């Protein structure tokens, strides 16, 4: 399982693969791991479908509950703090074999420069968080291969389409190197899922755009 996130001028993009495994046995082929949590943020957890959907459900409930009580949404720092509290309150269970490390992507609407308002936040096992400054991040078992691919491909990113293409290619490289990550499935027609957040909000990327991008990458590598 691998989720990637990268920043482009005017927004941020996040994408993940679709495989779930029980040892060496493939247990799922259509897992969704990236969820929109509010109008300007999205979360991705590298794990089973249930853990991702449940963590995203609880985080979205907390954010909307605050918005309804107080009349205004939380600031980006407040959202990071609430997520960090939820992650920290699970360390004993994580060391008991149930560890969920999330990745957060968002757009800050109160920033002075809108072209650099995209944000990426990662978390560690102890519950610590870091705002990333290089422009990309990856979590999961193929995260090192994906990060090494983005390190070489990031110079080509100039807007949303280039960023989406680079994210799909990084996921393809992670699948090429690690067997717990699933590649594009042309026989069944299953492709990675992506979310784009910009000044207008977080939207889901349609499956045909991802399919055309993945097919172009495959013909390029042939």
């Amino acid at each position: 399982a691998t989720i990637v996130a990268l920043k482009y001028p005017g927004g941020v993009v996040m994408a993940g693969d679709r495989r779930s495994t029980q040892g060496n046995m493939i247990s799922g082929r259509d897992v969704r791991k990236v969820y929109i949590t509010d109008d300007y943020t999205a979360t991705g957890i590298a794990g089973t479908a249930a853990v991702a959907v449940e963590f995203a459900r609880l985080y979205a409930v907390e954010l909307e509950h605050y918005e309804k009580l107080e009349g205004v949404p939380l600031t980006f720092a407040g959202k990071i703090n609430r997520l960090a509290i939820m992650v920290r309150g699970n360390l004993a269970a994580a060391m008991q074999g149930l560890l969920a490390l999330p990745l957060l992507a968002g757009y800050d609407i109160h920033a002075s420069d809108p072209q650099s308002a995209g944000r990426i936040v990662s978390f560690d096992a102890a519950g610590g968080w870091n705002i990333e400054e290089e422009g990309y991040q990856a979590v999961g078992s193929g995260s090192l291969f994906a990060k090494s691919s983005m390190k070489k491909l990031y110079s080509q990113v100039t807007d949303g389409d280039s960023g989406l293409r680079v994210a799909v290619e990084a996921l393809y490289d992670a699948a090429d190197d690690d067997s717990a990550t699933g590649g594009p499935d042309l026989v069944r027609g299953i492709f990675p899922t992506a979310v784009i957040i910009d000044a207008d909000g977080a939207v889901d990327v349609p499956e045909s755009r991802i399919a055309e991008l993945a097919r172009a990458i495959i013909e390029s590598r042939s």
Binding site: R57, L58, V61, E64, H65, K68, L69, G71
Partner: protein, 215 residues
């Protein structure tokens, strides 16, 4: 003598609500319309509870603000425990009736508030809107057309019992309710709707020049 104490507590509560300002809720073609007199942009009388459930109140601000926070907490917990589509306005009206009856009976001073709960149909569905009125002692009534709370309600109730038209437009209904409250510009008016055409969240506020145009 329980009867004397009950009469005195009821009289105290009804004097308390009688000195407050009026809020009216109306069912129109696109949902439910909330209109209240509020000269403050900072202390709100109308709020949302869940995706298709709305809240309105009249009387002492802190009491119904506490009630609104409790209702939001209850709705959020119920929606997370079972699921979102399993939360209705009937359960909220029932829980409000129970808590107001308990406050009226056990506490030293009753709450001087009047509540209204409104629900609309889910997206892509056709169902008549529901309006529930909850009274300070815990009485709950179901109203099909409109609810008037606060201040002197008989003249407003007559001015709306006439001229009310089902399946009216937003502009016509807003004008009609603004006329009925006089028996007021952008300031001193708080206006919100429950929009049945919205995909998930039906609550939205009408403020500023957008409210000015529709007047």
């Amino acid at each position: 003598s329980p009867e004397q104490a009950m009469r005195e507590r009821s009289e105290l509560a009804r004097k308390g609500i009688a000195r407050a300002k009026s809020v009216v809720a109306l069912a129109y073609a696109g949902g439910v319309l909330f209109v209240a007199e509020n000269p403050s942009r900072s202390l709100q009388k109308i709020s949302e509870l869940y995706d298709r459930v709305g809240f309105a109140a009249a009387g002492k601000f802190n009491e119904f603000d506490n009630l609104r926070r409790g209702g939001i907490q209850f709705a959020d917990t119920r929606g997370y425990a079972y699921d979102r589509r399993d939360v209705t306005g009937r359960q909220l009206a029932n829980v409000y009736a129970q808590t107001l009856g308990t406050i009226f009976t056990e506490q030293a001073k009753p709450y001087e508030v009047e509540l209204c709960v409104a629900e609309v149909a889910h997206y892509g569905e056709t169902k008549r809107p529901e309006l529930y009125r909850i009274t300070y002692d815990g009485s709950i009534a179901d109203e099909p057309h409109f609810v008037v709370m606060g201040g002197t309600t008989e003249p407003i109730a007559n001015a709306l019992k006439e001229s009310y038209a089902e399946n009216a437009s937003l502009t016509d209904a807003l004008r009609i309710a603004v006329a009925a409250l006089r028996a007021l510009g952008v300031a001193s008016l708080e206006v919100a709707v429950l929009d049945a055409n919205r995909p998930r969240r039906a609550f939205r506020r009408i403020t500023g020049s957008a409210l000015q145009a529709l007047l």
